[PDB]
Amino acid sequence: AITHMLRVIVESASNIPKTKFGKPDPIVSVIFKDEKKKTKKVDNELNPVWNEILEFDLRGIPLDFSSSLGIIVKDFETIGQNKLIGTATVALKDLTGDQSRSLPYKLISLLNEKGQDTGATIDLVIGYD
Ligand SMILES: [Sr+2]
Ligand SMILES: [Sr+2]
């Protein structure tokens, strides 16, 4: 039996909210089935670009109707815990089946801790290897 991987390209984000002083330093956490991989941070940027590629071992478990990807965008803090900008959960059901394909996932709204749209978005490309 062959190994399959979920491929996530973190492309960019837009309209990250301004901070009172200085500028936010965005960094994205990508979580698939509790495995977390991060991007690099981008310094002092409201519209960051990464073009970073992450791949997760599916470990023989196929994608199904309920499969999803978690995204958390935070503002890097050198001292202690980074600051939340927003989250998204992305439905992966369009990748189900045995056909390798990639799809764009554009203008994904990032939601704050109250679940409100922040006006910021992230763009991904996600594929089934
Ligand atoms: Sr900064
Ligand atoms: Sr910061």
Curated annotation (Swiss-Prot):
Expressed in myoblast and endothelial cells (at protein level). Highly expressed in cardiac and skeletal muscles. Also present in lung, and at very low levels in kidney, placenta and brain. The C2 domain 1 associates with lipid membranes in a calcium-dependent manner. Residues 5-105 form the C2 domain. It is found in: Cell membrane; Nucleus membrane; Cytoplasmic vesicle membrane. This is Myoferlin. The chain holds residues 1 to 125 of 2061 of the full protein. It is linked to Angioedema, hereditary, 7: A form of angioedema, a disorder characterized by episodic local swelling involving subcutaneous or submucous tissue of the upper respiratory and gastrointestinal tracts, face, extremities, and genitalia. HAE7 is an autosomal dominant form characterized by onset of recurrent swelling of the face, lips, and oral mucosa in the second decade. Belongs to the ferlin family. Interacts with DNM2 and KDR. Interacts with EHD1. Interacts with EHD2; the interaction is direct. Interacts with RIPOR2. Calcium/phospholipid-binding protein that plays a role in the plasmalemma repair mechanism of endothelial cells that permits rapid resealing of membranes disrupted by mechanical stress. Involved in endocytic recycling. Implicated in VEGF signal transduction by regulating the levels of the receptor KDR.
